[PDB]
Design a protein around this nucleic acid. Structure first.
Ligand SMILES: Nc1ncnc2c1ncn2[C@@H]1O[C@H](CSCC[C@H](N)C(=O)O)[C@@H](O)[C@H]1O
Ligand SMILES: Nc1ncnc2c1ncn2[C@@H]1O[C@H](CSCC[C@H](N)C(=O)O)[C@@H](O)[C@H]1O
Lengths: 285, 174, 285, 187
DNA sequence: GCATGTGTTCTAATTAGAACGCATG
DNA sequence: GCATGTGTTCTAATTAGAACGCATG
């Protein structure tokens, strides 16, 4: 019996390298991790937090079919496109076919370019992520181009924050019930620094809008510290998202710059739940 | 002695150009391709020509929609990797797509567009795998004029049908 | 004298609790650590990074004789008064008797109040720190009021940055030469994150100025990254000063707020050296 | 703190800082007509060994200048406190130990707060004397000064005194009065 | 000599907060 | 059901950058 070989990943719209982070937590060997990203803040985090393992390739629109063949074969193809023109939180959203919603089709093209041809029964896994708060047509259109329906997973059941997301893909057992682990921080109190009191169990969805860190329409402060009320700290937002502490503390970034990266990123425990069955297919530490 | 051709027609009706050019039902046409899964195109028999085109200048949907839906159904109607016979596809634009949409078109269809002119009056952009669509040293026309041609048309086909011409040798017969 | 006992410390102008950090690092057991601090950011760091061990008392001018007597007896009295009116880098400095310069006398007063009575044999140590770039008359008066001559200790000998500081005190072996330990990072290169290259061996004195991080009269950038110049990151400044990484990453503080705290604090290895022989005089857990 | 019989009393040794009170203490009879009182003005270089050498003291006096001060107003207090702690006797010391700091309205509210913080007590307003003519603020460990019911002076009426005097006695010299029952009287 | 400096105060550029918005599950 | 939102924009407070500053080892 032939032994399992390290996984080969193409990560589109990588962000702060959550995919690589999760794979390394699962102890999965990764031979190559080729990621497409434009934001300087995102790429800088990736280089530092992973010691330059990631081969950064640039704009997703610069990635050709031959490049996919030349860099391949890819065992895993993950991606999470901008939802600034998809989410119904933006009254100025330009839909799926205009603005940045169009970037979704780049994941669509490259996914088709990365798949094995006929007569190739080799394992090929992929995952696409976006919000549930989008347009009905757009949700349908995404399902039509990917030829699949999304699994809905709220990070509310695995973290201390609401985050209902859609997940398209063929990962083994995407639909299976979510189980809590020993190191799953479900309560807000678990994510706070010492001497700080949590007012709520869960917090609402964290966005790039800085005031999304305040709960309710009344904009309540989430945390009480020392005779005054306070918002979540950057270190606490990281723990809420399931990221390592001080993960985004690079390149002199402010609170807003860090919440911008975290705001658009994945919930680590959710991705871990989805990537966990990949351990059965590839080499491990 | 070469068999005739199943044509899949997208968005615009070429039941006049293919019948007047002499190219009973061998042609399939769909107008709203929104709910067209893979099985539908598969059930409509094999295809030797998959045609799609943007609506005439001044017709009702985001210009990239036609380009994206074309690419989707085109990948549905491809034959086995071991080619059983001759397969051809072509996407036709009528100066609707802007600069960005042309870059998207070229990247998704993995080849540069051929500019098809008329003497200067009506213009057409063509993406096609036909070795004879590209072979024709097509009459050169400047882009700026093409932009002005669309600008003078806001205020309000032939040799493109001869683009169907080189498809005769592969097909039959009339 | 049955055995060694946990040290009782009075820290005036505590800042980011460099003192307690060092006492902890030396394994010295701490009975109490009373800090007099007024800055909100500073106090927050000390509360978080030391788990509310520190007993904060507020303004130093609010600390009375009765307070010292009740809170004590103190084994160690350390302090580093503001120098923003003492350092010659400030063209509008007010001197030792005006502005924040007079806060030095508050240390002089509390030192006098914390000292043991006549005939008391018990061990009592004190340490006072301030800059070298002060007036020749201000340096004179500080020595006169403290009845001792200071020891000039530059952090460059034990860290990766110039920091010429005067140290008044009575600690065992304050005059002995500085020996670089295995843990000390002596060059800027060792303090940089991955993929970063140092343009200089040691950086110049880091003040609260945004461009004290730049070098020379030409204002050169300290590091190289991706063939493009850059300044030091907050995490890097903490390595240079000798602090733990992300020690100041609290309360959503910006780069300025973080550098403002680091600029005024002590070089950790310098304090580690000075506090080193105190582990002989006190209980070490 | 207690009063001792007349024959056991001794001539007071006085450390008079910034300002000589050799004329005030003589007219009251604390020093003989023949030359006991050390008057130092340039205490900037005065160390602890100097004061100890300069002989034990019973009365360490302090005062801010009325005029032009070469040094900041707070400089006089800080230096006074420094030397006062130098000249303090051993805990088992016998004779009366006294100290005094006098202000001629030249210390601001912030500097007044600092003074009371370092000397661990609030000052005493001594007026003299029918409109008010002169007044001084006094810090001392002398019982009678912080006990007598002096005339109450409004702060809004003291800043007026600092206005016309900056535009430029007997009862004021009664701060040394209650020191007669502790040391030798000469007459 | 002559660079250096536990700072302060100018800008133009961001940060942090709040308002806005309405379709979707 | 209705209230929740991987967003954008605008406003005052802060930031990051740079000029200014001259006594001192
Ligand atoms: N044209 C483009 N090419 C490549 N990446 C792009 C892009 N336009 C936007 N992006 C990136 O797509 C990302 C979408 S948010 C997804 C981030 C990711 N899920 C994470 O875990 O961090 C953003 O970080 C943005 O920088
Ligand atoms: N009135 C006061 N009472 C107590 N601390 C004060 C004060 N005025 C200023 N300070 C503090 O004195 C410090 C001067 S620099 C002190 C830094 C400290 N030694 C460290 O290693 O971190 C500043 O933190 C400032 O907040």
């Amino acid at each position: 019996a032939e032994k399992r070989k390290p996984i080969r990943v193409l990560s589109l719209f990588d962000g702060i390298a959550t995919g690589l982070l999760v794979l390394k937590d699962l102890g999965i060997q990764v031979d190559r991790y080729i990621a497409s990203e434009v934001c300087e803040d995102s790429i800088t985090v990736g280089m530092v937090r992973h010691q330059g393992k990631i081969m950064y390739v640039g704009d997703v629109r610069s990635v050709t079919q031959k490049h996919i063949q030349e860099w391949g074969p890819f065992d895993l193809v993950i991606g999470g496109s901008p939802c600034n023109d998809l989410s119904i939180v933006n009254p100025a959203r330009k839909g799926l076919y205009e603005g940045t919603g169009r970037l979704f089709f780049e994941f669509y093209r490259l996914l088709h370019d990365a798949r094995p041809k006929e007569g190739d029964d080799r394992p090929f896994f992929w995952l696409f992520e976006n919000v549930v708060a989008m347009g009905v047509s757009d949700k349908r259109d995404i399902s039509r181009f990917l030829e699949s329906n999304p699994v809905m997973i709220d990070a509310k059941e695995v973290s201390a924050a609401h985050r209902a997301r859609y997940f398209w893909g063929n990962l083994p057992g995407m639909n299976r019930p979510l189980a809590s682990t020993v190191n799953d921080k479900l309560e807000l109190q678990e994510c706070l620094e010492h001497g700080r009191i949590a007012k709520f169990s869960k917090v609402r969805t964290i966005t790039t809008a800085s005031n999304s860190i305040k709960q309710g329409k009344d904009q309540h402060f989430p945390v009480f510290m020392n005779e005054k009320e306070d918002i979540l700290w950057c270190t606490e937002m990281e723990r809420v998202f399931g990221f390592p502490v001080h993960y985004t503390d690079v390149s002199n970034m402010s609170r807003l710059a860090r919440q911008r990266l975290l705001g658009r990123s994945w919930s680590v425990p959710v991705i871990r739940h989805l990537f966990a069955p990949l351990k059965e297919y590839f080499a491990c530490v | 002695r070469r068999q005739p051709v199943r044509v899949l027609s997208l968005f615009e009706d070429i039941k006049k150009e293919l019948t007047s050019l002499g190219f009973p039902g061998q042609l399939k046409h769909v107008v709203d391709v929104t709910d067209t899964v893979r099985k539908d195109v598969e059930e409509w028999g094999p295809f030797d020509l998959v045609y799609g085109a943007t609506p005439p200048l001044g017709h009702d949907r985001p210009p990239s929609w036609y380009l994206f839906q074309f690419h989707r159904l085109l990948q549905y109607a491809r034959p086995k990797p071991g080619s059983p016979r001759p397969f051809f596809w072509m996407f036709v634009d009528n100066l609707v797509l802007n600069k960005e949409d042309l870059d998207v078109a070229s990247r998704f269809l993995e080849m540069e567009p051929v500019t098809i002119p008329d003497v200067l009056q009506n213009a057409v952009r063509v993406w096609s795998n036909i070795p004879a669509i590209r072979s024709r040293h097509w009459a050169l026309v400047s882009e700026e004029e093409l932009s002005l041609l669309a600008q003078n048309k806001q205020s309000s086909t032939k040799l493109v049908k001869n683009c169907f011409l080189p498809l005769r040798e592969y097909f039959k017969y009339f």
